[PDB]
Amino acid sequence: SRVCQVTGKGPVTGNNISHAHNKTRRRFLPNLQHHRFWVESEKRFVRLRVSAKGMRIIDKRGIEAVLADLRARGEKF
């Protein structure tokens, strides 16, 4: 489903207030894309569907640290 595999960001819900203040149920989707991340210590790519906030977290913490606790949680890659 549309959850980031790094952050767990799924879709959330809210409203669509008009100028006459009609509220309508919409939904807020994460900016999740597919990205291949190079791991040196495995000599391959892993391809995980992450948000852009997850991309920034990979940039800050390293792919090895995030890929360590993806599998403690028990994700695919």
Q: How far apart are CA 3 and CA 61, in angstroms?
A: 20
Q: How far apart are CA 65 and CA 52, in angstroms?
A: 17
Q: Does 35 bind RNA (CB under 7 A)?
A: no
Q: Does 25 bind RNA (CB under 7 A)?
A: yes
Structure tokens that stand for 40 in this block: 């040196």
Shorter beta-carbon distance to RNA: residue 28 or 38: 28
Which secondary-structure segment (H or E) carries 72?
helix 63-73
Q: Does 45 bind RNA (CB under 7 A)?
A: no
Q: Does 12 bind RNA (CB under 7 A)?
A: yes
Q: How far apart are CA 43 and CA 51, in angstroms?
A: 24
Q: Does 51 bind RNA (CB under 7 A)?
A: yes
Binding site for RNA (CB under 7 A): 1-2, 4, 9-17, 20-23, 25, 27-32, 43-44, 49, 51-53, 56-57, 59-61, 69, 74, 76
